[PDB]
Design a protein around this nucleic acid. Structure first.
Lengths: 117, 102, 146, 63
RNA sequence: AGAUGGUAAGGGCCCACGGUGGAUGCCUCGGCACCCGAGCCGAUGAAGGACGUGGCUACCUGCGAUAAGCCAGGGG
RNA sequence: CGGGGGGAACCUGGGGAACUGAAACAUCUCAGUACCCAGAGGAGAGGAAAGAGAAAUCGACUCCCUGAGUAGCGGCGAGCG
RNA sequence: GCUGUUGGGAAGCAGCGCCAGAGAGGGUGAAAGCCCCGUAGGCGAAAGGUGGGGGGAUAGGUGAGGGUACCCGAGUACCCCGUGGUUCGUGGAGCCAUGGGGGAAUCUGGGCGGACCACCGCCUAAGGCUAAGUACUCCGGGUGACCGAUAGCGCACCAGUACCGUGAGGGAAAGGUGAAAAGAACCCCGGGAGGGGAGUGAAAUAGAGCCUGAAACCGUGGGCUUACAAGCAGUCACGGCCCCGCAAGGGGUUGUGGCGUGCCUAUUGAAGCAUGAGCCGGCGACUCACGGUCGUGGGCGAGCUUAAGCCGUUGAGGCGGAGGCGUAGGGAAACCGAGUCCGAACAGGGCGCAAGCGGGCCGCACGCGGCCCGCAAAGUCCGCGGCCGUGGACCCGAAACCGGG
RNA sequence: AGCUGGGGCUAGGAGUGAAAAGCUAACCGAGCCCGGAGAUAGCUGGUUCUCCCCGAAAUGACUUUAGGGUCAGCCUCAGGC
RNA sequence: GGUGGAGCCUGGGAGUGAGGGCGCGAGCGAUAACGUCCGCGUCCGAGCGCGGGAACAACCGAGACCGCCAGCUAAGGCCCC
RNA sequence: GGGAUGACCCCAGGCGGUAGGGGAGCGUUCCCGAUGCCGAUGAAGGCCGACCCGCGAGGGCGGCUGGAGGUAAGGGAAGUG
RNA sequence: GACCCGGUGAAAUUGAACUGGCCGUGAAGAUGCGGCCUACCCGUGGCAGGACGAAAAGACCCCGUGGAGCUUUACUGCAGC
RNA sequence: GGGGCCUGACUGCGAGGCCUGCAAGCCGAGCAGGGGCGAAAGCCGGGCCUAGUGAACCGGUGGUCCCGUGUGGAAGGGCCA
């Protein structure tokens, strides 16, 4: 038998060419250029999936800060109230209360800074 | 090459597909002649058969048949026994079978 | 038994070991990654370093033979009456070779251990101590060959 | 093709039943000029290891 | 005093359709191996060729100034 | 009457390397290999014992399996056989 | 073996039959034992080779004692010197060959049995001839877990050509319309080439280096997007725009903002201003053979097992015990032997051996005999797999050596 | 000791050389072609699909050895304890 | 005490025998070198995977099986970027 | 440890990794399976696919092209990516 | 000649480019890392500082138990005498 | 350091260890043979101790029971030194 290359190659090749659509220049017309670019795309994602998770913690904290500051206090003290008080709740993500329910948020602050008095 | 010859003529027996004849009324070396001899035996053509008889006259017929696999006694192997669903053997080709096995 | 199923047992492992691809034994080809393993090394059954092999040990076997050749000689293959108590009646070489030991291995001695059966044992020579066991019923054929 | 036994080895070391390689003690074919009987005497046979393993591999056909 | 839209000479990414090109599949008048068979030609001029031969004929085959053919036997 | 010249491999005879191997390298190896030359044929060579070698043995020669990597040969090296 | 049916076209699907010593295979508009060529099976030569396979013909050979003592292959045997052959390399070196010197004999001879000598044996040199069994494949045929146009011979095709070289020599590329030429009348633009209709075809993005027609690469059209910008070209997060959906939701694009030092190789260390690569497609590197050694699947075990070849097939197997491993080891060897070697040593010591059983089950002898089993005491045989050895042994690559021209 | 046409001889360890190791068919401290040959290359380079478990070394001895090897060290797989 | 991808015995297959920074104890050097040689340890090698250190193999933190628009921290930070 | 051996569920640990050891898979070509089965209502190949199964290599399935070959399970070989 | 227009129309090079400066850093000489500075998009004719620019697997040096030419009271042979 | 006898600077072994990749190197009680010195106990297998050295292969002299290429004996070997 003579296992000539034939079909096999040409298939895996246009398989990477597909993953590589929308790239600049040859990054999408060359298997090689593609192959590479993809590897980078491989880790850039992987890393950013973990970054994304830290990305949004920032978004939230900055907001959370800006909200309970125009009210009366800082973010350092605010998270210590919701902690000494015992309200292991909010979760910087759900602190969108500062965006939606200011009346509900303001409540937390008041029962937060009060955790100190 | 023997324990494996006997064992093949074993799973042909337990299945029942084994069967040894002795006579061949419609012989004379004609297919039309043979084709009948089967029906009046249990060989409809639904089970590829292996013919192993030391009588050329009989082969003459069985030969040109699809579901039929001619042969001869001395040439009793395992590859044919297995490739064929039902096995038929004469008492003379069977006579040697054992002389070969033990 | 159906035709398409006599299948190889549970260990025919045709799994060879191709060493070319990304994962598995690969690239530098499953093994090697240095040099002097590219088409051959020296041995090592007996070679290299460049030093005294280990051929520093000398030849004892004093008699590696002159040039005419090895000298023709009667070859004695001793047997144990231990392995001899497998059959009864007449015990002579020929019925011995085609049976167990010797196989044209020239002459036949006889010694062994264990209990000996009280019969006839046609041999070329008997071991002293292992012959006192035949002093408890048995035969004693000697010489022969001409 | 076939394998050739190593006469060099075959001529100087004997292989025993347990599969052990045994050869004379090296150090007395002439050294001497005075070596306290003890030395010059103390010379029967001996072994090796990882080394006799290498031998047997050359005395194949001669088992 | 203020602000986000818009222009595309050209370029980029995606989709469509062609072009260039001749991979892949499928083909097989060819090759490859092994086993049988069979095994010499020549001064009666061999092997291998030059030229030439067709009504018109570049070349290949084919023959040989009897020139893609001549006699005769068989065969269809 | 014959020869001359040709013929893929094969064949016999007359000549006959080196690289390599020895982890350098002279003996040794490669090797009577490649190659040149002569001859012969569908084969060629060999062939009826001034043989073998230890058996009151065997009985042309060619060829295969064994003997056998034996017996030995060997800078007793490599390796040959 | 015809018919109906689908279709451009049946052999497809369908109804009912039939031949078969012939259901190999090829072709026919697609896929058919029964339509065409074939196949199994059975005949055939006036001519030319082949030809004891079978009988003749002759050639030619045909006899035993007892006496002599006439012949038994010459520059030879033989010895010495120089070499070659053999496993034999100077070795204890015989044997066989022979260049040189010397140099017999005719069986009471002479050669040989590995120096030599003595016994005991073997064979007749110096003249030829000699079938069959063995080796090879230009050509012919036959099969293929052989290739399929970068493969396979260098050549599937007008190739040892074209082309290159003074020469020896080197040495290419290049296959495919369709079932059928039915290969496109004529008309329109044009000098032509090309094309647009008409026309053939089931198909013309099958229209003539024309099946398939991939990727690189080059264009037209359209959607998203960019002229205050900064980058291994992406990734993540929002947002605008276009787009298929009944919708949760999903695509394509890219405006912001976050994070990012190509691939490979070699390296203590490479984004590296180290190596390699223009891009795509195809060719492209750990194999086989025989030994060996471990593992492992089976066969059988006081054993296991065949090799060449012979009768059988022609995808069928048997037979064949020459022989090989195993059953005992120690010693240099004679040799002894569960021992043996060293030794004076019923000191010591070095290699050695001492090898079984859970028990299925059973003659119902109150015996575990003892089959069998894991497979052994213990091993062998085949398979498969790892590594080793000899081979060009993972693939490319020298400068160089040698031989004939 | 001129230059030149035509006709001829000399060649690979060889020729020829008013001598440079110059010339010997556009690269001569040993021409070219084919062959031995798939020379040897302890060197450079290259070495193809996926997934899973474990995971080194760059030290010691010796080596015409020093960027190569052999044994040990360190890793892994199977069995045992 | 210690059940750990600890050990110990037999066997198959290995790769590695060019190391590097740092700390500590020495030699060499000039108590010069991103120097050089040993020793104990560590890390990179192979963790150029992630955080801090502006950037940065080996310094501080810490051994990355996958996914999460959830939380506590290490080093290092909390005026803006 | 379950143990109606139930390789189907529970309890607790492990899972960065180069040279390398080891373990299971995917695809290619050819072979038995085959006088069988897919097929012109459309083979292999090709072109798309945001859909389906696998961690992956891959595999299905649908539309278009294309116009004649293709070949399951289960295995077997090797010019196998 | 170069430059503009009509006609024909190459080449080495070429990982892919969306390819600025400065301090610094980094395998010690960065368009590509960090900080800051600049900077609308695209060409045409010029200049040669950088892309450790092109070309040539450094001609120097070392290494290889590599190769060749040459020498001699190196070894060992041979032609010749 | 002096003296008297002496030759144990023994033959055949060697339990058990130091050291170590290999092979080497080193220590050694104890048993037997036959001895020295001592009343005896006992000590003596060279030297107060650590350097004073060289695998194998090839050969030479002794010895010796081993092999002696058809037999006897040789040639030639083997073993111990």
């Amino acid at each position: 038998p003579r296992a000539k290359t034939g079909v096999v190659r040409r298939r895996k090749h246009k398989k990477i060419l597909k993953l590589a659509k929308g790239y600049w220049g040859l990054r999408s017309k060359s298997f090689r250029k593609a192959r590479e670019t993809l590897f980078a795309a491989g880790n850039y994602a992987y890393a950013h999936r973990k970054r994304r998770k830290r990305d949004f913690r920032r978004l939230w904290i900055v907001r959370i800060n800006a909200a309970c500051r125009q009210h009366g206090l800082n973010y350092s003290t605010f998270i210590h109230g919701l902690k000494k008080a015992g309200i292991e709740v909010d979760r910087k993500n759900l602190a969108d209360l500062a965006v939606r329910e200011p009346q509900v948020f303001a409540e937390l602050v008041e029962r937060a800074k009060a955790a100190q008095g | 090459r023997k324990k494996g010859l006997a064992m093949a003529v074993a799973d042909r027996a337990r299945e029942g597909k084994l069967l040894l004849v002795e006579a061949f009324a419609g012989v004379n070396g004609k297919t039309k002649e043979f084709l009948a001899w089967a029906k009046e035996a249990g060989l409809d053509g639904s089970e590829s058969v292996l013919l192993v008889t030391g009588n050329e006259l009989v082969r003459r017929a069985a030969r040109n048949l699809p579901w039929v696999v001619t042969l001869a006694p001395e040439g009793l192997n395992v590859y044919d026994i297995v490739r064929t669903e039902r096995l038929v053997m004469d008492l003379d080709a069977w006579e040697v079978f054992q002389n070969r096995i033990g | 038994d159906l035709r398409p199923n006599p299948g190889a047992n549970k260990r025919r492992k045709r799994v060879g070991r191709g060493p070319g691809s990304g994962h598995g034994k690969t690239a530098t080809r499953g093994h090697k990654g240095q040099k002097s393993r590219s088409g051959g090394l020296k041995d090592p059954r007996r070679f290299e370093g460049g030093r005294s092999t280990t051929l520093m040990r000398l030849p004892k076997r004093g008699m590696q033979g002159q040039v005419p050749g090895e000298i023709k000689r009667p070859r004695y293959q001793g047997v144990n009456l231990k392995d001899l108590a497998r059959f009864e009646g007449e015990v002579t070489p020929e019925l011995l070779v085609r049976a167990g030991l010797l196989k044209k291995g020239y002459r036949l001695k006889i010694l062994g251990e264990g209990e000996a059966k009280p019969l006839k044992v046609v041999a070329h020579a008997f071991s002293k101590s292992a012959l006192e066991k035949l002093k408890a019923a048995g035969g004693e054929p000697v010489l022969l060959e001409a | 093709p076939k394998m050739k036994t190593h006469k060099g080895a075959k001529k100087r070391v004997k292989i025993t039943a347990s599969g052990k390689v045994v050869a004379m003690k090296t150090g007395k074919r002439h050294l001497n000029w005075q070596k306290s009987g003890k030395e010059i005497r103390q010379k029967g046979r001996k072994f090796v290891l990882a080394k006799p393993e290498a031998e047997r591999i050359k005395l194949l056909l001669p088992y």
